[PDB]
């Protein structure tokens, strides 16, 4: 709880003044400086207060919305201005998670000086008012979202100008021994067996393939030819995992959708074909195999990061392939490397902690990430290197943030985040799509339970060539593929009109099953 909010609500200081005071580093400054002890606590206090207020409204005969039935106007306008100006100067870690919250507020249905949002109309008016300040971000979403958002009646009721602007924006559219051969034959047979039988119900991977794999590994260890097996494994993984007839594929895409309730920020999980190798590696339980795999993957990752991509201003498609391959390889390397230390218990504070830090800090990391990030960032090319680095750290354990080595990397990332302005194009000299991709991928990193939540807030302060940065290399398809969670805004919009007619709801009709 802070005294700044009610003070500003009661007409003491300008919103821009507090936004500059929070972002940077005559009596208005002195009055604001009297509450210096609450400067850091303003943002989470405001976010918790707003979340708690919506509990009355959010779903923890229908009446259409009416702009003339609002309870008040001035307080709502001030709150909306504060919220919009907090996003405009990047006071919050993840923009798309905040866009999901306003969209949820937009579809309310039923049920300090005074509690706010006492009626549905107030909530709808708030949602309309805040959304009006972010035309640029919405204009670059997919076609289906533009379809759904341009036909809704709430926007027409509360702001015909917004409906007209969105409607106009629609038109924009597109040496080895003999036994190695026998082992590779067995491996191909196992792959075919999984390719065929993994889909039918009742299948269990361990019970059906927990015997032949171990024997294969044992005989391979006896023959001592792991290098060829690892090379074949890596080649197969890279070749296979990546990848009217326009109706079958579109329909089938429903049946391979991710978890429905996991959005907008879900934990990492291998989708589809990539899920095969995870259980193979888990059930192998071999020391030599893992070491060879780590060496090969590290060498492959380091080799690909140094490609000199030619540039012209024709078209080029290699960028998507190299980026996706780098992402996959980094994810697998991160999963394998930190396997031993993935403990489910955080380290309690006290003298006992220092022993763990001393013990775990004297071994070098499997891949020097810090120098790679520092060298890359100096010569632009940030868009090529940031995503896979983010993927690598996503699988770390609880100790890693407490270690000294990675704190410098985290500080560098935080310093980079604050420079990613969206409106200030005149000085950025950077394309919009790259900004949107980098902001989305950085904003997802801070939501994982492993990273401490307070690291984003408690920092006093963070503070030349022509390369791959300026070219508009990122495509909407690439952005949606690398950011699978962006599309959940459309799914929430679709449910607005689907659950309208067939609103049964209750009468849960308990049913008791049977057993032999």
């Amino acid at each position: 709880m802070a005294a700044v909010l009610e003070s500003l609500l009661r007409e003491e200081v300008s919103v821009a003044a507090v936004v500059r005071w929070i972002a940077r580093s005559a009596g208005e400054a002195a009055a604001l400086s009297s509450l210096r002890a609450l400067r850091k606590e303003f943002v989470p206090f405001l976010l918790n207060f707003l979340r708690e207020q919506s509990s009355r409204v959010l779903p923890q005969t229908d009446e259409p919305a009416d702009p003339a039935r609002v309870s008040s106007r001035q307080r709502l306008e001030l709150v909306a201005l504060v919220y919009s100006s907090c996003i405009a100067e990047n006071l919050v870690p993840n923009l798309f998670l905040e866009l999901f919250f306003v969209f949820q507020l937009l579809t309310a249905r039923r049920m300090l000086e005074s509690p706010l949002f006492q009626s549905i109309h107030d909530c709808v008016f708030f949602a309309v008012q805040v959304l009006e300040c972010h035309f640029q971000v919405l204009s670059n979403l997919d076609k289906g979202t533009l379809k759904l958002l341009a036909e809704n009646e709430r926007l027409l009721c509360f702001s015909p100008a917004l409906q007209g602007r969105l409607r106009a924006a629609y038109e924009g559219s597109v040496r080895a021994f003999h036994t190695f051969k026998k082992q590779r034959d067995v491996f191909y047979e196992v792959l075919r067996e999984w390719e065929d039988h993994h889909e039918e119900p009742g299948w269990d991977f361990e019970k059906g393939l927990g015997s032949r794999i171990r024997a294969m590994m044992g005989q391979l260890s006896a023959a001592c030819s792991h290098s060829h097996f690892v090379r074949l494994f890596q080649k197969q993984l890279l070749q296979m995992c990546q990848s009217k007839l326009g109706r079958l594929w579109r329909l089938q895409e429903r049946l391979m959708a991710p978890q429905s309730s996991g959005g907008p920020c879900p934990p990492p999980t291998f989708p589809g074909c990539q899920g095969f190798f995870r259980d193979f590696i888990l059930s192998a339980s071999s020391f030599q195999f893992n070491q060879h795999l780590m060496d090969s993957l590290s060498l492959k990752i380091q080799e690909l990061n140094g490609l000199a991509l030619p540039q012209h201003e024709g078209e080029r498609k290699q960028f998507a392939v190299v980026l996706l391959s780098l992402r996959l390889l980094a994810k697998f390397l991160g999963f394998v490397a930190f396997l031993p230390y993935r403990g489910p218990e955080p380290p309690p504070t006290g003298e006992l902690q220092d022993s763990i830090l001393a013990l775990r800090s004297q071994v070098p990391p499997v891949l020097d990430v810090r120098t790679l990030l520092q060298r890359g960032l100096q010569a632009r090319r940030a868009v090529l290197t940031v995503p896979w680095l983010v993927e690598f750290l996503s699988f770390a354990d609880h100790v890693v943030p407490l270690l000294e080595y990675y704190r410098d990397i985290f500080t560098l990332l935080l310093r980079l985040h604050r420079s990613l302005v969206l409106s200030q194009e005149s000085e950025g000299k950077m394309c919009f799509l790259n900004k949107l991709l980098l902001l989305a991928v950085l904003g997802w990193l801070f939501q994982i339970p492993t990273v401490p939540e307070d690291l984003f807030f408690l920092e006093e302060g963070p503070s030349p060539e022509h390369g791959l940065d300026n070219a508009p290399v990122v495509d909407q398809q690439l952005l949606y593929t690398c950011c699978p969670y962006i599309g959940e805004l459309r799914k929430l919009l679709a449910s607005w009109v689907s659950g309208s007619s067939g609103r049964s709801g209750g009468f849960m009709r308990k049913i008791t099953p049977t057993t032999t």
Partner: protein, 154 residues
């Protein structure tokens, strides 16, 4: 590891006319007694263009679930033809089955559905207005579809 595994799903009354209710027999086994009641849902895909055309046919909540295998029969009503656009009225569609624990989906079962006219002339020359009184719906039980997810059971 998942505490609940679905053994086998068997299709009943196939094929059948359009107005006939959907029927399924679900076989599943649970290793240990659960702490909350299991819930199931079925969604019909009206069209492939958008998710706005989905119908929520029914949802049931199973009673207390001890260890061991369990079997039960599902009964649900037929979809309403009015909400279905004519373009996707005749063709191929998919029906989905989902079960959630603690409000988290962890197994999704899909079946291909092909709707086609019984009569020869209607099959060759369907009318402009899709007549649902003479349409037969078949379930391709030979190719079931299952997809699982990792959830926090505890």
């Amino acid at each position: 590891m998942a505490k609940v595994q679905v053994n086998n799903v068997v299709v009943l009354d196939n094929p059948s006319p359009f107005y006939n209710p959907f029927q399924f027999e679900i076989t599943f086994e649970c290793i240990e007694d659960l702490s909350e009641d299991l819930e199931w849902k079925i969604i019909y895909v009206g069209s492939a263009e958008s998710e706005e055309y989905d119908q929520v046919l029914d949802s049931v909540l199973v009673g207390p679930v001890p260890a061991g295998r369990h079997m039960f029969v599902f009964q649900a009503d037929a979809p309403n033809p009015g909400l279905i656009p004519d373009a996707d009225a005749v063709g191929v569609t998919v029906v989905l089955i989902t079960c959630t624990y603690r409000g988290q989906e962890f197994i999704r079962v899909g079946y291909y559905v092909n709707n086609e006219y019984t009569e020869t002339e209607l099959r060759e020359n369907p009318p402009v207005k899709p007549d649902f009184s003479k349409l037969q719906r078949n379930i391709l039980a030979s190719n079931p579809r299952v997809t699982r997810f990792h959830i926090n059971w505890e």
